[PDB]
Amino acid sequence: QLPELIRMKRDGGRLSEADIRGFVAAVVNGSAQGAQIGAMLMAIRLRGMDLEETSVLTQALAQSGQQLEWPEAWRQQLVDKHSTGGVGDKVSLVLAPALAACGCKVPMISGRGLGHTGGTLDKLESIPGFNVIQSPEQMQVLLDQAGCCIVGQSEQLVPADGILYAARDVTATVDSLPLITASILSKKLVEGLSALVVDVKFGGAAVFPNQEQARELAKTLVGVGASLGLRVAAALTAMDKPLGRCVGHALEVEEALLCMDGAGPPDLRDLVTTLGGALLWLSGHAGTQAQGAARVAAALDDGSALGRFERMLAAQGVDPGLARALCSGSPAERRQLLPRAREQEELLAPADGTVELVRALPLALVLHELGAGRSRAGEPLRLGVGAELLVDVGQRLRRGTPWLRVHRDGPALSGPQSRALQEALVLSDRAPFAAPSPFAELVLPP
Amino acid sequence: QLPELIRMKRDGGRLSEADIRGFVAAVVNGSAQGAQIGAMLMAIRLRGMDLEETSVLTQALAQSGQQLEWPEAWRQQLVDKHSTGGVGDKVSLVLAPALAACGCKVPMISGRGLGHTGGTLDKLESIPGFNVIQSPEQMQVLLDQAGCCIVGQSEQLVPADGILYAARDVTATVDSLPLITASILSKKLVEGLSALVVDVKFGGAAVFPNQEQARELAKTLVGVGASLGLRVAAALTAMDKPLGRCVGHALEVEEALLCMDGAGPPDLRDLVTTLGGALLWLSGHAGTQAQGAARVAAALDDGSALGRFERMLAAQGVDPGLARALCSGSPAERRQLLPRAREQEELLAPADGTVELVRALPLALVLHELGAGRSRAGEPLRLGVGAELLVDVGQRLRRGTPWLRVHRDGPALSGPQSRALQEALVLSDRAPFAAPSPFAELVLPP
Numbered sequence: 001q002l003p004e005l006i007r008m009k010r011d012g013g014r015l016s017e018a019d020i021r022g023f024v025a026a027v028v029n030g031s032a033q034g035a036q037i038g039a040m041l042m043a044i045r046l047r048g049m050d051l052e053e054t055s056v057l058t059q060a061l062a063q064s065g066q067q068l069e070w071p072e073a074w075r076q077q078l079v080d081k082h083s084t085g086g087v088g089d090k091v092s093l094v095l096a097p098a099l100a101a102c103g104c105k106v107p108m109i110s111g112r113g114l115g116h117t118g119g120t121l122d123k124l125e126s127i128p129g130f131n132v133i134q135s136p137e138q139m140q141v142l143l144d145q146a147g148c149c150i151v152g153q154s155e156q157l158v159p160a161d162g163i164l165y166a167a168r169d170v171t172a173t174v175d176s177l178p179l180i181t182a183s184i185l186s187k188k189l190v191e192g193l194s195a196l197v198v199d200v201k202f203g204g205a206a207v208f209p210n211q212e213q214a215r216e217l218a219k220t221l222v223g224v225g226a227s228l229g230l231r232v233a234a235a236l237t238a239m240d241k242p243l244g245r246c247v248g249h250a251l252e253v254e255e256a257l258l259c260m261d262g263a264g265p266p267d268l269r270d271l272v273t274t275l276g277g278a279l280l281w282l283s284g285h286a287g288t289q290a291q292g293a294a295r296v297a298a299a300l301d302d303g304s305a306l307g308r309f310e311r312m313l314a315a316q317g318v319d320p321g322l323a324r325a326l327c328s329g330s331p332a333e334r335r336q337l338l339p340r341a342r343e344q345e346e347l348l349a350p351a352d353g354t355v356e357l358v359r360a361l362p363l364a365l366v367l368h369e370l371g372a373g374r375s376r377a378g379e380p381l382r383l384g385v386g387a388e389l390l391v392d393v394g395q396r397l398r399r400g401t402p403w404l405r406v407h408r409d410g411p412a413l414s415g416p417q418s419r420a421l422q423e424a425l426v427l428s429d430r431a432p433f434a435a436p437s438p439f440a441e442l443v444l445p446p
Numbered sequence: 447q448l449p450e451l452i453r454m455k456r457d458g459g460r461l462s463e464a465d466i467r468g469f470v471a472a473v474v475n476g477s478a479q480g481a482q483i484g485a486m487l488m489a490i491r492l493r494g495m496d497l498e499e500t501s502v503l504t505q506a507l508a509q510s511g512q513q514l515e516w517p518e519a520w521r522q523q524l525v526d527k528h529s530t531g532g533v534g535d536k537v538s539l540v541l542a543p544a545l546a547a548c549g550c551k552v553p554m555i556s557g558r559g560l561g562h563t564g565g566t567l568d569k570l571e572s573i574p575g576f577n578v579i580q581s582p583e584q585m586q587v588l589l590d591q592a593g594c595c596i597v598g599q600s601e602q603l604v605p606a607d608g609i610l611y612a613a614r615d616v617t618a619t620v621d622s623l624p625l626i627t628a629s630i631l632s633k634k635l636v637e638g639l640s641a642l643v644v645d646v647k648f649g650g651a652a653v654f655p656n657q658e659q660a661r662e663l664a665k666t667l668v669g670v671g672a673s674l675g676l677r678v679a680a681a682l683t684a685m686d687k688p689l690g691r692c693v694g695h696a697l698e699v700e701e702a703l704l705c706m707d708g709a710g711p712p713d714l715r716d717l718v719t720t721l722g723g724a725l726l727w728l729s730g731h732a733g734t735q736a737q738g739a740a741r742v743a744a745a746l747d748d749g750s751a752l753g754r755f756e757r758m759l760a761a762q763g764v765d766p767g768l769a770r771a772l773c774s775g776s777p778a779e780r781r782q783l784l785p786r787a788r789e790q791e792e793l794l795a796p797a798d799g800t801v802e803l804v805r806a807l808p809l810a811l812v813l814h815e816l817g818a819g820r821s822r823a824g825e826p827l828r829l830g831v832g833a834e835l836l837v838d839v840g841q842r843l844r845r846g847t848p849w850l851r852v853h854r855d856g857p858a859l860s861g862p863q864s865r866a867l868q869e870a871l872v873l874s875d876r877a878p879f880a881a882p883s884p885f886a887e888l889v890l891p892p
């Protein structure tokens with residue numbers, strides 16, 4: 001029974017396959033209570049799991065629901081990428097459609113926000129009518145039509161993970177190697193993918209700031225994934241500063257769109273082309289990293305990524321007209337069709353100097369307490385709330401120049417909140433420089 | 447917010463008084479979700495709390511509800527006793543009315559089962575009509591007409607403890623010195639007592655088997671109690687074997703009534719007189735402890751605690767006729783008036799030998815899975831389920847002599863169930879001896 005299983009883990013003992021499957025079944029069928037879920041999640045977070053338990057949690061979460069079947073004509077076309085989570089990380093919003101443009105099939109099952117990081121599903125929900133929950137049947141139609149699709153956990157698609165994911169988010173049990181591994185792979189295993197690239201963040205606002213832990217996760221994701229029959233590669237990418245300039249939901253959707261019609265900040269386009277190019281390589285569609293990167297980049301310039309993105313929006317519930325407007329509209333028009341915070345508050349530079357860095361963690365934490373993230377499961381988010389980096393890293397600015405614009409619904413920023421933000425603006429006084437790219441290294445399966 | 451409070455404790459940090467009161471209010475008002483209550487509890491169970499946190503929790507729980515207001519004329523009479531939970535530990539049932547058999551006012555706020563231990567509130571419920579939820583007003587009337595009462599936590603009395611109590615029970619977070627401490631003391635502080643005696647168990651079926659760990663609890667209980675302006679004494683008693691010969695709920699009420707009949711097992715009576723003795727002394731209604739143990743014992747026969755029990759039962763919802771029935775009724779009559787298990791299964795001595803011990807834990811565990819224990823929240827119990835020790839410790843026996851009577855409602859005992867219970871009977875080659883007395887020592891407040 002639940003109390004005993006929890007007790008074993010609490011004592012630092014391992015769970016047998018039956019126990020794990022037992023636990024997962026109880027979660028899915030609703031017999032497990034919230035406290036028991038939270039208790040077990042914490043026991044794991046604090047005591048851990050070995051690679052066998054871990055692999056078992058994965059198979060279990062994966063099997064708690066359906067297995068996605070596709071036309072065998074799609075077999076080698078099926079690919080996906082997943083990010084462990086970060087700030088301003090709307091890569092998936094761009095990659096999904098940019099791949100489906102290269103003929104690739106992407107049945108992406110992602111998630112909502114986790115802790116201080118943003119979830120792509122919450123970002124898509126900024127778009128009116130976008131429905132994250134799609135059946136396995138609709139998903140097939142989606143791939144047939146736009147060859148794109150970004151859905152979330154549901155009754156049919158990894159329900160066990162859906163429930164745990166939402167509990168982890170608000171029980172301080174996000175940063176657990178085995179829970180992240182099972183959660184991520186279970187989603188991807190159910191997809192029947194040919195290749196998969198997981199973007200494992202490291203740095204300031206990463207689940208695992210510590211680069212060495214980012215690595216351990218990277219190697220584990222790939223190892224367990226391999227052992228479970230999935231061609232997987234992991235990319236370790238910086239998340240010390242936000243990706244792009246926009247952080248939030250509604251705001252990140254417009255930057256994603258800016259990226260899709262050939263523009264946007266270089267770091268964003270870089271990560272998109274490097275992971276996509278790494279993904280095309282992994283799946284055999286591209287000969288080398290550079291070739292695959294170029295094809296994806298071409299999709300960003302082509303207008304075909306944006307086009308696939310448009311079909312996806314319409315096929316997942318967005319009114320065709322709004323879909324055509326988001327993709328056909330200019331930055332300002334998109335900004336108007338998407339949720340908007342009630343107040344705009346710009347932060348000014350405290351001095352002259354170079355933007356050495358903009359701490360992503362402090363920024364996400366404040367964005368978090370302003371309604372961008374959850375502190376309770378099922379809690380509505382204030383889509384619209386977010387932030388815009390008005391200055392890039394590597395550029396020089398003077399005191400008095402606005403470097404950040406906070407989009408908020410509530411009161412003017414609190415005291416400790418303002419301090420935290422300014423605190424995030426690191427300045428040095430040297431010549432301007434070229435900001436480095438997020439991507440660090442690729443970890444392949446043994 | 448909740449997620450952060452949990453992370454702090456999760457990481458080993460202590461919670462500020464504002465944090466704990468913050469968390470407690472969230473538990474009482476609903477903002478804290480099940481998974482969050484469980485996460486917090488497990489974090490605390492694994493990273494502990496310090497004396498101040500513990501002290502602060504205790505206050506918060508006590509203050510989560512109402513403070514019981516009594517007529518000044520009683521102030522000096524209001525006493526109570528508590529247990530850390532055990533097996534067959536029906537002492538409060540016998541001791542509460544026994545005390546009220548000496549003018550003392552006992553507004554006992556106890557609780558339900560906790561882990562593998564039986565709760566007196568569950569025991570009282572096997573008594574048709576008995577209500578455990580009495581508002582403060584009813585509690586005054588009860589003491590006024592019967593001198594005692596046994597109620598449970600409610601929206602009005604320690605709401606916060608009620609919630610943590612029910613969750614800890616099914617989350618393997620019962621055995622936490624600080625949680626037990628705040629839980630026990632919070633209920634007592636709200637009672638406005640002038641002396642509290644806690645029976646801290648140690649032994650095979652104790653929350654804290656290790657006698658030294660139990661002593662740490664006993665010290666904390668008295669220490670923190672003292673710091674909160676409550677005269678508290680704590681006894682340390684054995685729980686390697688079951689207190690009495692009857693384990694369960696309806697069955698525990700019968701053996702209890704037998705004790706209030708001036709009969710029963712030495713086990714029970716001995717413990718009820720000792721702790722009661724310590725109580726009357728502690729509160730000043732007795733010059734010494736032996737005199738108290740004497741007045742209490744007298745009440746078992748003369749002065750009538752059985753008489754006080756009847757008035758309590760009636761005053762707490764039990765039909766007056768049934769109440770008198772249970773009192774004047776003899777064992778056989780008592781059984782017919784209470785819930786009886788559907789069937790009866792007896793175990794036979796696996797071999798000749800002297801009964802060195804009847805391991806309480808294995809007993810509780812099995813009775814537990816037959817419906818005597820909870821596995822979820824308010825999961826209903828099978829109150830007639832239990833066991834009768836058909837043999838005493840110290841005696842010898844021959845293979846074939848039934849040593850245990852199991853009262854179950856479902857299927858006959860299973861293989862692993864029978865094996866578990868058999869392994870509970872420890873036969874030694876020694877000569878017949880007299881079973882020792884539960885009581886070990888008494889820790890005091892100065």
Ligand SMILES: O=c1[nH]cc(I)c(=O)[nH]1
Pocket residue numbers: 083084085110111114174179180181183184187207
């Ligand atoms: O699906 C997931 N993405 C990111 C993380 I971190 C996780 O645990 N699961």
Ligand SMILES: O=c1[nH]cc(I)c(=O)[nH]1
Pocket residue numbers: 529530531556557560620625626627629630633653
């Ligand atoms: O009221 C209580 N009795 C026994 C235990 I153990 C506890 O934690 N609380």
